[PDB]
Amino acid sequence: SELAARCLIILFQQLVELARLAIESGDEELLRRVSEWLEEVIKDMRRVVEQALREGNSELAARILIILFQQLVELARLAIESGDEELLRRVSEWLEEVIKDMRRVVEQALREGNSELAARILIILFQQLVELARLAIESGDEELLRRVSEWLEEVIKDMRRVVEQALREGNSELAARILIILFQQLVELARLAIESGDEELLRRVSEWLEEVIKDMRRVVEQALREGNSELAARILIILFQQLVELARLAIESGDEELLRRVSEWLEEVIKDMRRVVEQALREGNSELAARILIILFQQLVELARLAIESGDEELLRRVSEWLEEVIKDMRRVVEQALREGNSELAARILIILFQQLVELARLAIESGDEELLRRVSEWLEEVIKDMRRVVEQALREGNSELACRILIILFQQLVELARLAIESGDEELLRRVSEWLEEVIKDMRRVVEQALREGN
Amino acid sequence: SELAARCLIILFQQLVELARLAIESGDEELLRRVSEWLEEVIKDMRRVVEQALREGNSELAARILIILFQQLVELARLAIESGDEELLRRVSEWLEEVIKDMRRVVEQALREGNSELAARILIILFQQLVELARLAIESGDEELLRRVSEWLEEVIKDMRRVVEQALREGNSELAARILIILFQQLVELARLAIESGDEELLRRVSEWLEEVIKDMRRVVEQALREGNSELAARILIILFQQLVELARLAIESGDEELLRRVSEWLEEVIKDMRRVVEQALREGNSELAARILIILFQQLVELARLAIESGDEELLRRVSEWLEEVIKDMRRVVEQALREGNSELAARILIILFQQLVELARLAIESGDEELLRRVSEWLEEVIKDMRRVVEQALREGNSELACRILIILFQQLVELARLAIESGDEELLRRVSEWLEEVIKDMRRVVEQALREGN
Amino acid sequence: SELAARCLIILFQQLVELARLAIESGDEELLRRVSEWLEEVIKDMRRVVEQALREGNSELAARILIILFQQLVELARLAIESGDEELLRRVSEWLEEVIKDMRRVVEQALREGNSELAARILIILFQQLVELARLAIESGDEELLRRVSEWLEEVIKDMRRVVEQALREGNSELAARILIILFQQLVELARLAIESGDEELLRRVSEWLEEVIKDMRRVVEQALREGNSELAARILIILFQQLVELARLAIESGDEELLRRVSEWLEEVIKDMRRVVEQALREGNSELAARILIILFQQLVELARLAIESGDEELLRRVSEWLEEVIKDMRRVVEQALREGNSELAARILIILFQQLVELARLAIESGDEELLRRVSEWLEEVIKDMRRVVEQALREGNSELACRILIILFQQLVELARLAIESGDEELLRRVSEWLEEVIKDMRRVVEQALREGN
């Protein structure tokens, strides 16, 4: 059946190539003959798929339909670009038939206990449908787009059941991967709707996005229940990043309604992530706890940048509040690290945070947002105080090397911040930094004293 | 004697370099002194050659004279370009003396039983003479060209005797190589005559070419008598290629008399090749038989292209008849291959032939030659019918894989041919091809059926 | 103490970077604060240097001060370019303090028996002082330049005592290296004075150069007394090259007074070198003796080129006399080599000399200096006669190969010389060369005869 498939697959491809020649030349008589030949090959291929399924080879069965569908979409593209509605009609009907077959192959795969293949089939199909949707969107074919958007919905429902299956199989990893990929594809489809200005499609997708998010949060819950806080974190981190990417599309397009929905989704993810951080701390994994908050903070600053550049004070407000909450958590993680006797990690957390705060400060300085800059400069001060206590700890631990490294890095970062103040002409910030610089110098000189006393 | 030679060779080169300075500056007094120094060195070198020969080192003796001759020709070039007839005279006399020595070294080599060296000496000398001839031709020095053309004749006669020797030694390989190289050099010389428009030189060369061809055909005969049909084929294949190259020169220059002679030579070679194919088949080597006809057909199509582009219907006619004859032979070789149980080779032959026919068809289509296209399209049909029977054979042999590959390749080639018809707007050809495409599809679907029945 | 140093070094660098921002922006208040911070760090660093010395780590102590000094000079550059005399003042005072420390570290190193480190410290310091001097020279700050030139003098005195120490330790190699490097640095400083037109600085440097030369000549004496004629040669060869480089500066600038002094220094070095050649010959090392004269001759020709291009007949006269003296020595070395049975070396010497003479001849020909060309053409003749006797020797030794090589090379060189005569139109030179060419040819033909008689 393998060879049988290969023959028909190659033939079909060659027929489509011949069809292209007929389409471009405008030879309807040849195109007719070829389109009839294409139909005959499809029927054969579907019987080969049947054979493969009867042989217990659902993998091959899937591959055949996947390739065929791709070729049909390629043929559809030719019809769309040429404006041949009759051919496009025939192909769109062929596409539907293949989809139905593929869904039965997915069913078979699930019955065989192969949820992995089942997922892969639907994931590929969905991607191909979105590609076909793009053709409909760009060409402005609402009838085709309608059909595809309905096909997309059906695939999503199947995928969610495959996610359910994966969870029932105890494979929360796969369950996550499916929803993560789907969400990404939905956002890509959303982008097409946003750029084209198709509010109806965007609506449908935004509803699909919401449904996926809810599923993902339950997968995160599952992961946490399985004692896999690492995966739980990864899921939310990826989701948050994707939400920010979607937010960017809303911000640039000026879609406040979508941005609202996403900003609410972002908030929900943050709350989950903070509970995962809590879990990690309860598990004695302060390292992961730190990494989660560090990544989140970076993503929040990136989102803040979008708000700052666009001039969205309402979003910036929300993010700046989220940033504050993360900072407080991070400082408690630093405390934890110090209590664990890990002054190294404690230092690294504050050093990274400070750098990120200075980066955020730069955005405030360049944009001229004194209110944000104020908040950040206060956050910077708080971090410095913590760092100096970590330096103290390091010295008490007999680690004058680390103590030095912390102050050296901090001083460098302060000078970088000073540069921003100097170039912008912000004497108030420069004053604060120059005072911070002095304090660090005094500490460093005491570390030098310590080093000398240690014979180093 | 080795060092002795090296010293004089280097000195002579340096003297020629000094001569160049005198020539370019126009210092006749210095040039005189150097030309006298050159003469003295030559006399010494000839005595070193004598010594080498007396030492039984004919190899060194040859090398000395070969290098000297090259240096003399380089010096001659300086005289020719500067227009110094007095120097050129002296050098041309020196060249003659060296040639006489070299011919005696060739004699020595032959007496030593070293026909290989003997050949190499004359081959190199001939090449150098042709290079010198080029200088005479471009400068328009008929007196020098005359002398060289006489020297060329003398070398040819020697080479033919070396070929005879090689054949008497049972070395038909060397005999072939000598004539092949000589023929190539003669064609190169012919090109110079053709481009310059020297009919007298071209005449002489064309007569020399004829003589070489006759020798080569006897070497082919020898090779066949030795049971070496492979070499016999290679000789005729190379010769034919060289004849077509010579034909191209005649076609582009518009020399119908030369083209006539070559086209007659081409015919004679074809007849020989077909007998070599017969021999190969009688030896049970259908592979070689196929390769010979495949190469010949390709060369004929290349020659046809020249006729088509130039618009020479008479040549094209002759070639198209030659093409037909080759096709008939190839189909019998396919039959043989099938009878030998080698359906793979049978397929390969027809596949290659079909591709070549389509390439020829392209030439007819682009040129608008409906008569040629007709003939080719009929040839294409005949090949298709054969291929379908080979597919049948393959299926009967239980080789559905090969059966598929044949039809897949054929279909691709038909689509390529269809493209030519579509772009040119030839509905009649497109019709024929589209019918051929349908027939192939039906076959392929039966091969798919077979594959499924085989459990593949 | 290592870490302690690293911390302060990094901090100081960062403070200077911050200072740069203040300087460029013109923020005197920030610059003030930083300059005070810089002072505090310096004081700490000097105590770390003290610690390092107390720990017996004079290496680290040196490294700290060397780095600090470099950073201070970088800061000074910022002050100089910005025109901040107040900052420059503070830095120049800091520079002085560091120098005093470094000199005590040098003292320590010497007391530890580490004259190598002692040298390295002063060498680096001197280089940094010259770099600082350059800044003063280009900016036109005579007050800073004065201070630096006094610092340079002090370092030189120290270095000469380190050279003395090295000699007392039996390390004439290091002693040489120190003076060689110092001299090079002095010439570089001289260049700055010459280009800027600072006769007062140039005077001081030229006096320093003289003092170094005297030391170097005593080191050469030492090396000779140690039986190390190789080192003795290398020292004078390098010195001579450096003197010629200094001469070039004088020639291009047109400073006859400096050129006079250098030309006298060149003469003194030549006399020393000739005595080293004598020594080498007495040691049975004719190879080294040759190499010394060959290099010297090349350097003299290079100096001659400068005289020729500048049109300085007085210098050219002196050099041409020096060239003659070297030639006479070389011919005696050739004699020695022949007496040692080393005809190969004898040949190589004359071959190289002849090539150099032809190169010198080219300069005379292109410049049109018939008097120099005459002298060289006479020198060329003398070398040829020697070479022909070396060829004779080689033949008598049964080495016809070498005999050939000598004449072949000579002939090539004669033709190259002939080319110069031909292009320039010098019939008198061309005549002489053409006669020389004839003589070589006759010799070569006899070598060919010999080779044939040898069966080669």
Author numbering:
A (entry chain B), B (entry chain A), C (entry chain C): 1 to 456
Give the exact sentences the study uses for this entry:
Circular tandem repeat proteins (‘cTRPs’) are de novo designed protein scaffolds (in this and prior studies, based on antiparallel two-helix bundles) that contain repeated protein sequences and structural motifs and form closed circular structures. While these cTRP constructs have many favorable properties, we have previously noted that their ability to self-assemble from smaller subunits is compromised by relatively limited contacts and small surface areas that are involved in packing between repeats and subunits. Based on those results, we hypothesized that a new generation of computationally designed cTRP proteins with increased repeat size (corresponding to longer secondary structural elements that increase both particle thickness and the number of buried contacts between repeats and protein subunits) would improve both the energetics and the stoichiometric control of self-association. In this study, we describe the de novo design of thick cTRPs (‘tcTRPs’) with repeats composed of longer helical bundles that form a new underlying repeat topology and demonstrate their solution and assembly behaviors, their structural features via X-ray crystallography and CryoEM, and their ability to be functionalized with additional folded protein domains.
